[PDB]
Amino acid sequence: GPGTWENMAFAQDSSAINNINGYLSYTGWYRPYGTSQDGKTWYPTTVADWRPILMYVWPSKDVQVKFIQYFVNHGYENSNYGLTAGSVKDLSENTASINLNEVAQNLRYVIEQHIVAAKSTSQLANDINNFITTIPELSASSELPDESGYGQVIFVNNDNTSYADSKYRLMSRTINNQTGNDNSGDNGYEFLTGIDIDNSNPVVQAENLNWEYFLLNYGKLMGYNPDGNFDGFRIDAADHIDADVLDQMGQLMDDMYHMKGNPQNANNHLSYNEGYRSSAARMLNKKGNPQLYMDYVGSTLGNVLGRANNRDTISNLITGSIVNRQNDVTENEATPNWSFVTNHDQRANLINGLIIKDHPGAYKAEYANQAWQEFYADQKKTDKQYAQYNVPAQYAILLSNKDTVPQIYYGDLYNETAQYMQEKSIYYDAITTLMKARKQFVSGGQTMTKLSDNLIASVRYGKGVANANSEGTDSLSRTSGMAVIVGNNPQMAEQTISINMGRAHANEQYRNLLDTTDNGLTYNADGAENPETLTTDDNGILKVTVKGYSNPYVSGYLGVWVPVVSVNQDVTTNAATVSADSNKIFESNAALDSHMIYQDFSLYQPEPISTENHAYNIIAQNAELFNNLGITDFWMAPPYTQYSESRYNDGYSVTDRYNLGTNANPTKYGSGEELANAIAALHSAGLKAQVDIVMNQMIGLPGQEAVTVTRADNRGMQTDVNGKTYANQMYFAYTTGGGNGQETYGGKYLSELQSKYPDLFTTRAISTGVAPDPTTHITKWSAKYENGTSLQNIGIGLAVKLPNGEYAYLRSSDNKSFNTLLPSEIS
Ligand code: NA
16 A cells, blocks of 8 residues: 555666666655655656655755755745744754654655646756755865866776776876886876876777877778878877877877888878977987977067066077077977967967956856957057067067977967958968068078067078078078067167178178068068168178067067068978988978978857858868968867867867767868868868877766766875865766767777787887787777866765665666665665
């Protein structure tokens, strides 16, 4: 017959009870055998009638009382069941168990009334979520965020979560701590954000090689445009992943394209690593430079020229880089690097900050339109507060700098929040003019001479001219080279300066390529203090008039002088097929200097309002434009499928590593078909394409897994957050996903890789002393292949523990470790 025995779960399996690897949650729901609204009549539940576990079971009698008090005070009161503000206000943990259970049961009758009345379990679900916030232990605050609202947990071994155990999880094995013999050193930390991937696990190291091979043959393998294949990689968070994968990538690329011997093969398959840690340059040089080091001159440029106040001296442009350019007259000595003006987190770190100013640390509703309108408005002004000063001047330095592959930002050529390449920025004309000038003029040795604290003269001596004294070996020697004068003081006094152009440029006329005026810059010398053409003296000295200007384009001075010519000229050095050093992959020389990278995306790039607006489609239309500007290499956005609730949909919140978009379901950039056509369009114009490869993290994995966690710092060592900490805690983290792409293409090309390139899976990795393992294919990511996750806003108190101290467990289909053990109220 009927009774309170029907609070029992219909059956004790996954069919009737919510569980994550057999373990119950207070957020979790279950199907009781029967429910009741009065206490007299009990109706046997159907498989449509589920109820939350927090109605029946609680962590402690304190929370049982607080659950009763909250619900009653939030419109679940009924004096016909002795439930009113007053009747439940005096109850505490010291109240009798036999008493509280009567009140909790009487409340459970009143909740069943609301479910019928409201005709759903939606307000109940809403009220449970709101109650959990009031209880500090069940709340999302229990996982201990730091003062900045950030943090991370590490996945550790445990008897309860033995499936999620790992022999590896070698954390912060980065740069020069690959061996783990300087954990406290200059290595770079493991955790950034999202679910951190364990790149120390040999199976994951094999999956990375599979993933690289897929991208290097994307067009052919997917049956799209067969020339739609990536030639290299932009390596995301290279300083925050086991450096074994940087070695293994270098091995694969050398095996496939034979780059070690031939600089031409090397340069045609360009790879560059995100991370400016000086230890990275040291590490890469020692290995023979498998990838290009990220230079920090972009930070120097923003400090010297970029700021409104507090501008660092002009001499920092000489020394504030991995390469010293006081008198750089040598080749194959400088660290092979890739530099820029606009840092890759710069726009984000400015726009974010402009939000928390407008709305002070308030809930993040998308008023980024406001922040961007403020940015665009500020950008046009002379007296800027937010946007960079001297943007043209910063690029003039970058594009004239020897021993670097310069990288242009899409957002500096175009308004990056407008539809892709619809609106040019005010700095388009300036930067594009300097870009074309680079291909024609910029070559030979470099000398950056300080004329004052605020003024500098960066001179290039032209192709086949080693230094100031050189005659000139090449036939373009005489009619190539450049002088880039940059003042960072807008109240600098009018004065005449002397610039040593070199012995090869004695009694030679020089065109006024670019000069400053009251309004901005002039390309025909109109408005400037210097005429269209000046001639050098007998010793090759140029007399230039300079003064301090203050306009939207220049806060100081900018002047560029190139030799007078009759013809189109191209000072690109062709790479040899026999290297000076056979130990090296990449060498900082005229051949590598001839290259120029282009970041083809912004984070704040908008969703396309049609197929024509797809970035891939527009890139394919303007392949020859990029070629005209002198762009050789194309850094393409991470083209992977994204977390639907990601802020930007930028590509770094990767949900499927092999799904690059379909005709019906494209990314923000477009479909895989369009990507392949975009890559082929660039290839057609003699350009190469590098893919943004995100081996560090994955974000938005929909499958939850019961994992054991410890609150750790961003290196993976346990940390104490304002006195509090926790280790060996149950955590229902989102660990499991990958999509059909990881399922379909997961370790599917390892057979082919092992047949053609056996050395890949025999070569012992430094961090493990063990080769990558291709015997297991990763078709679905889980905790076992992960170091940890950034705090997921869930809490550490959800795991249901019985009065005896043991976790509540179910012996489900796959869940079969220990014996079934449910709370008293659910059996
Ligand atoms: Na990492």
